[model samples]
Target: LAGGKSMNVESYEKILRDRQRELYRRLHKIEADFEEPRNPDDEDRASERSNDEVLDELGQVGQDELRAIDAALARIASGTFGTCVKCGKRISEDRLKAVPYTPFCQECAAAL
Candidate 1:
């Protein structure tokens, strides 16, 4: 071991898979706003705002997922997944599995 530091890909993959499934389930339940075609109406403004909020929330979820997927794929290519982007240290396996979308480990994240 180099200076007693090590990496664990299996744990990372397990966490990544679990997070993907969890997000997939959440996405399945989420419904995008669908309004019937009609003339402009002021009453729709409130509803539109609500829809925008929902979309924003969903977008955040989707973006996190996409980032996780990309990171996982990158690991497959060059083999560096659970490393904290900020500190270049091996991220915790539990953290990776719990939040695969995270670019930084728990420590780095809290630091930031």
Candidate 2:
């Protein structure tokens, strides 16, 4: 029997592009604030530290998602996005709907 049909790769491409652009926009906004000087008062200092922590968390997430998006796009160009990169199995529709950029099937991903 023939294997299951491949996914509509274009949809994943659009999802990754949109997500990457959104993250890049947010990252640019945060980086723009980093160039400005802040107040020296204790209250302001504490608030600034909190802001830095929040920005760091966002940066980490944004960077990671961006890389995943890029990888997904690359896989699309190579005709491999709908197949699990690890086990070569066709990824499920549920997982693709939940994480359109994923490179692994749920089972293979769980092993990692």
lDDT of each: 0.56, 0.67
Q: Best by TM-score, which number?
A: 2
TM-score of each: 0.48, 0.64
Off-target runs (Cα >4 Å) in candidate 2 are 1-4, 30-58
Per-residue alpha-carbon lDDT of candidate 2 for residues 1-112, written as tens digits (9 for 90 to 100): 1343666667778878778765765675754454235332343222211232344546777877776777778877776677777776678878888898777788977887
Expressed as tens digits, the lDDT of each residue in 1-112 for candidate 1 is 1322354566666556555544544553455343335543443333211222334545575656756665765664566666666777676767755666676789876886
Give every collision pair in model 2.
none
Q: After superposition, how far is residue 62 of candidate 1 from its true place, in Å?
A: 5.3
